[PDB]
Write a protein that binds this ligand. Sequence first.
Ligand SMILES: CC(C)(C)C(=O)N[C@@H](C(=O)NO)c1ccc(-c2ccsc2)cc1
Ligand SMILES: CC(C)(C)C(=O)N[C@@H](C(=O)NO)c1ccc(-c2ccsc2)cc1
Ligand SMILES: CC(C)(C)C(=O)N[C@@H](C(=O)NO)c1ccc(-c2ccsc2)cc1
Ligand SMILES: [Zn+2]
Ligand SMILES: [Zn+2]
Ligand SMILES: [Zn+2]
Ligand SMILES: [Zn+2]
Ligand SMILES: [Zn+2]
Ligand SMILES: [Zn+2]
Lengths: 519, 518, 509
Amino acid sequence: ASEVPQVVSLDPTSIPIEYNTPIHDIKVQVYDIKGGCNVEEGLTIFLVNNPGKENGPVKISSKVNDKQVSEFLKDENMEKFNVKLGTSKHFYMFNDNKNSVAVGYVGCGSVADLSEADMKRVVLSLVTMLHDNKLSKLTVVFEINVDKNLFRFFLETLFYEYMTDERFKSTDKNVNMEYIKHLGVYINNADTYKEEVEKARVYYFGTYYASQLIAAPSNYCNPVSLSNAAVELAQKLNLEYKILGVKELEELKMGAYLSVGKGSMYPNKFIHLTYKSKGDVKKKIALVGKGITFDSGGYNLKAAPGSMIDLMKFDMSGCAAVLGCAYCVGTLKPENVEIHFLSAVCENMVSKNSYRPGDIITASNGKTIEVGNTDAEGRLTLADALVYAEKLGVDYIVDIATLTGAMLYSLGTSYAGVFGNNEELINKILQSSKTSNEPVWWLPIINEYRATLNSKYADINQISSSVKASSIVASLFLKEFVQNTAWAHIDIAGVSWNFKARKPKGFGVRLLTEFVLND
Amino acid sequence: SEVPQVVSLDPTSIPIEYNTPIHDIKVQVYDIKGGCNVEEGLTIFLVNNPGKENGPVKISSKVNDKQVSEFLKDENMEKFNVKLGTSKHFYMFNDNKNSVAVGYVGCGSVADLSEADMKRVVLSLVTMLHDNKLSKLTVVFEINVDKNLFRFFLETLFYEYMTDERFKSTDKNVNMEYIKHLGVYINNADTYKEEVEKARVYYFGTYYASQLIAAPSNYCNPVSLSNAAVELAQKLNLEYKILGVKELEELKMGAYLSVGKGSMYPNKFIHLTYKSKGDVKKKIALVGKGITFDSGGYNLKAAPGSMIDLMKFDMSGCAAVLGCAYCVGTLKPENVEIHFLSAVCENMVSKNSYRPGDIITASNGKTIEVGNTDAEGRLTLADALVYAEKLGVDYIVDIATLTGAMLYSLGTSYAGVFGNNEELINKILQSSKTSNEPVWWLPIINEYRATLNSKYADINQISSSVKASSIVASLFLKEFVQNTAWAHIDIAGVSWNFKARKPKGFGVRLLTEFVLND
Amino acid sequence: SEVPQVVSLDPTSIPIEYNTPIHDIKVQVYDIKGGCNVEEGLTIFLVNNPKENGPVKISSKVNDKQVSEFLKDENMEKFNVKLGTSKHFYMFNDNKNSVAVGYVGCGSVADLSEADMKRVVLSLVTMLHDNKLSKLTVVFEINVDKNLFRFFLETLFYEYMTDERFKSEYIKHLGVYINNADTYKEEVEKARVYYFGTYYASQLIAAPSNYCNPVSLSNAAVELAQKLNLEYKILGVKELEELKMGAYLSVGKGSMYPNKFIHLTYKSKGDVKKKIALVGKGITFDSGGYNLKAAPGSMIDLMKFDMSGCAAVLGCAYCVGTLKPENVEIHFLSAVCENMVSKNSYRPGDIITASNGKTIEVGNTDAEGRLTLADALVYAEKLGVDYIVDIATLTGAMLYSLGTSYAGVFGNNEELINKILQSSKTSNEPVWWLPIINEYRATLNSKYADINQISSSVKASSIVASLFLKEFVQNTAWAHIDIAGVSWNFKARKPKGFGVRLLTEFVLN
Ligand SMILES: CC(C)(C)C(=O)N[C@@H](C(=O)NO)c1ccc(-c2ccsc2)cc1
Ligand SMILES: CC(C)(C)C(=O)N[C@@H](C(=O)NO)c1ccc(-c2ccsc2)cc1
Ligand SMILES: CC(C)(C)C(=O)N[C@@H](C(=O)NO)c1ccc(-c2ccsc2)cc1
Ligand SMILES: [Zn+2]
Ligand SMILES: [Zn+2]
Ligand SMILES: [Zn+2]
Ligand SMILES: [Zn+2]
Ligand SMILES: [Zn+2]
Ligand SMILES: [Zn+2]
């Protein structure tokens, strides 16, 4: 652990991290619907749909072990309500033991197969029922068809969206902040879904942990304070760790990554976490995350309209995703696999010491790079991290980065883009996208654009001249730093931040973890 | 002299190639009378056809080889035309049954090839040298050229042929093999032979400047650039002096010192001196703008089209001046003393940077209000010009990448020259013709001077009302020359070749021709 | 000839003032030797001090004792000669009549430029606008040659005159004391002619585009021709179509006003030894077309000024028609139209054919000037003249090259260019020679048309445009004057009428 440099004594010297969240205090019980539903304290919510019939009437088909509640929820009483996706209603009644209970439903539309996006709409409606209501318990009755993954995704999203980050609140803490202590789930074939519960809780926190890092402002989350948090995480998970400082970075000749950080008051820190199975290692993997704790753009300052320089604390989202994945892996402990978690962390600032547009810098594999734009710094840091990664001698290298703003014009805010040099690896990323329900789409590395990276003086240009297809050109650049290893690149510049909700998504954590686990 | 680093991987000197493959090319000039020997390598005829736009090629000169002569008959050459820029390759066997490669380059129908047209001919020729491993090139001039233009042909051939690979490591051209011999057949070879070594000298001066310019700002900084100058001065036995901050403070160069304040690299003032052996009749001060990187300062280059990634080229004036010092120091003209000056610094954004609105005091006591930190060139030049005049010279000439407006007035081919003395300006225009580096005389319109009147300082750095920044900047510069013939050359538009993505080394030959023929 | 209207309140002609109060001013020129009489009105001494911001000192003997006492060294040294600084005082003379006496500083340089002289006059005019005076007397205690003296009068007349045509008492006597008065007296009535030529052009330029449109501008040209007994011909769309002027006709397609080609002719009585065509750009309003002037700084509200070239030419025709030079034939030409946005407008990308058969690819509809000039130059050369001179508000880049004081001149002939430069010297309308760089010509090579209207990127727009126009003059001495920068006086919010005196001097000499 290094000392975080301060300008004034009021500068914070660590990232506040909440490990023990109220979500971890929730006891989850899973019951089979065949046994009938018991309705007592708290809130009991039925998830209902009506196949084919858009905005069709609500029907409760589950057995309810209470004559009063059963009478209330009979068809004739429910037909005035419809199943419009996201619709919710609260019911109030007395049960067979003369106790007042709260019941209700969330409409799940008229399609039996709910997409990952429509399921998020269902959960958000459910969360609005949790907010502003001091409840001790919530019960959920699944009257829709969900597979194991979508069930887990439901729980993960519930936990994530229910949670409220108050680390930076001082005088504006919510006085009515109270969480349930109990969560009941009624679902058919309950014994097959039980295994998903703790997995979801693990995936929730891995995702929530990343979110905390991303949301943490750059005066809290800087290269030293972020690497320090990585150390603390490794210590709690019994992961091996190594933080490389400028001296060793110099010895390794990482000129590209070092030049990006030259302008910052915070020394570069290269994070290297390792998980190894106790069993014989049958596959080795490196996960590489972009780790810019703040990206001012450098001398190519973000001063253009729509550049959102105030969002630039998000620029270590790739690193956050990787560290979030480290939590999940170190907790679930997969067998026969060795995983490296890597991030070349730095800050891209303006200074007398900054690297300049036009500078020629040498990467750790000896390639000279001409810098055409100081704000294209991510691919420079990744270049050295990718060289470092391949020297580990692994089977797959997967990187994840808020790399290019062009992603918002190509895939937008919902789907991440994946590029690569190996088809089998890309299919596996796409497969893990399905089973994690973190949407990713395969995008091409167009070789014809490679020629536009031909530098007159250096071995290669940092950015293209023609093109404008930045996401693809950046992928071309990165590919030049991976010689003979299966490699994939996940651009999350578009999906990292939830603009509507004004919070990080913790995107990529579940995706990467599913990738590690399912092979 | 010691180059500060942020990290140990930061370079501490500019890589400079002094002996180039071009220097290893043995050059022989033969007279066209007595015919041409075609025996080895690639023989190229430069042909014309005055009259018809694209008339047939007609090889006039005698070829001392029966087989080669039969091939180059008018009958066989009829299908090929003389369009300016075109070229063809030929394969055949000579008299002793040895395979030989012949060809031609079209020089158009016009009997007078201009600076731009000759450049086009050279390019066509260089294309033939590329992607073809040749031990020898022979060029037969079946067109007419003056002696300056012949020198210009060789200069341009040498400059364009040479490839800068100082910053390649994993991607050097493996097929890069230069010729070792160059043959030239031309009429009255006795007179043209003198231009050969003059061309080689002018070439390296230009290429030396180009190397400094192309060098990125992390390699090329105020300390390393001034070290490079010192090394140059040493190889040439020029007197040299590098003024550091402490000296500059004593001289009270507050305008120049302000510009480098935000930089990690200390300011360094380059003062080189050549003196003729005998009686000195003319004293000349050459001043180069030497900003090793121009970020704009707090007036950051952030506007569309400001091309901040090119601003390593903002020391081109200094490079021109140092390049001239090479030529002058090598050619050793008589009856002249020349001072090569450059206020070298770096314009950066920092807690220590000078600010828009700052009032600073030049070394001649004039207080200056800063309106824009990106108009830093004229601030450094101000102190440099005051220093220059204190040397008591006859002519002060500054050269600078000073105003972007030049791209809208003269464009990328012609530099602008401004001045306070018509005689000096005429000499610059004369030097432009003989060096074939095109310059156009632009006026210093005194009506715009009132817009440099400041409410609080003695003078404004920039105008607020008048556009035409090239003229306004000239007006500002004129305020720091009291009673000396002075001229100013703005090369902001011509310094960088945007199409070839490389510098031109513009100004080297111009300044040298100015020196030599005074 | 009938001006179309959208509503009945639309103006159907340009209001023009022919008889100005300047024409009522009686000018007397006296020699400074013999002393100056100060009997009435305002008397102003033009004074320098060759030092900087030095004290005022009056050298001329004044034949009035009271005023002499006022003008004594001890009193005037309280004031300084800083360029454009002025003081004037009211007092009683020997006859106990009210007189005003004062000065205007002319700085510390023995030779005033046209810019300096202008500042002097502006200070003089300020006093005239603030005082009710029947008479102004100006005493020259500075050195001025014949041309600069005429320039002084022209400038004085022009700046003094106030255009009130669109709104809803001048001096009657000008006295001038100057050493060697006799050599200067002939400059007076020439200055009056140059004044109105300049002011007439100013009137056309300042007239908004709803008053000044292609139809009313040509109608005004006709009326001018009739008053001066100049031959005149106005070419309409049918005539222009037959002449295959496709470049020029394309620009006006989107306008509600039919294109009008103005062709005025002055012919001397005797043998014609020189034939000259003067071509003025006549865009009555330039919106930019589909390449609309929408960018910040494009100043679309100024774009009534885009016929300043035509105005300069018509102002010259007044001077030439008045002074009647001998042994010359002058053609006054303008392809007048309006560049507008409409379903009918020409489009960026359109390939259009000029009257010499050259196909043109339009890259920017706001570069419309060179298109109208393309067909005007072709028309001009067919007249078989010795010189073609065009003048035009052609490129905004002129503001970045020479600025607002000097116009640029481009050409294909050295003799012609140096004639314009000499005319610039004698008219004191500053012009600077700029190169037509042949290396830039290749940027106008089109993939589909014979030539490009504009370059994709050469940035040197004034030069690229000049190259374009050069392609439409095949074997005649031709020069192009780009007055886009100098035509409008931004500070004074009015035209300069730039080019009238320049072009007239070119014709007369
Ligand atoms: C502007 C360009 C092409 C250099 C780019 O892709 N910039 C990146 C960047 O600064 N990388 O270091 C960029 C710009 C904007 C975003 C972004 C994403 C959501 S809002 C702004 C993300 C990446
Ligand atoms: C922006 C302005 C008017 C202050 C100016 O003249 N800038 C100079 C400059 O920064 N001088 O120190 C300038 C701007 C752009 C260029 C340029 C030249 C080729 S591309 C950009 C050159 C000089
Ligand atoms: C469109 C461009 C940049 C080629 C140009 O120079 N346009 C001309 C024009 O509209 N010609 O028809 C132009 C633009 C601006 C001005 C101008 C002059 C004083 S303020 C703006 C003048 C001419
Ligand atoms: Zn960036
Ligand atoms: Zn970034
Ligand atoms: Zn600058
Ligand atoms: Zn500069
Ligand atoms: Zn226009
Ligand atoms: Zn126009």
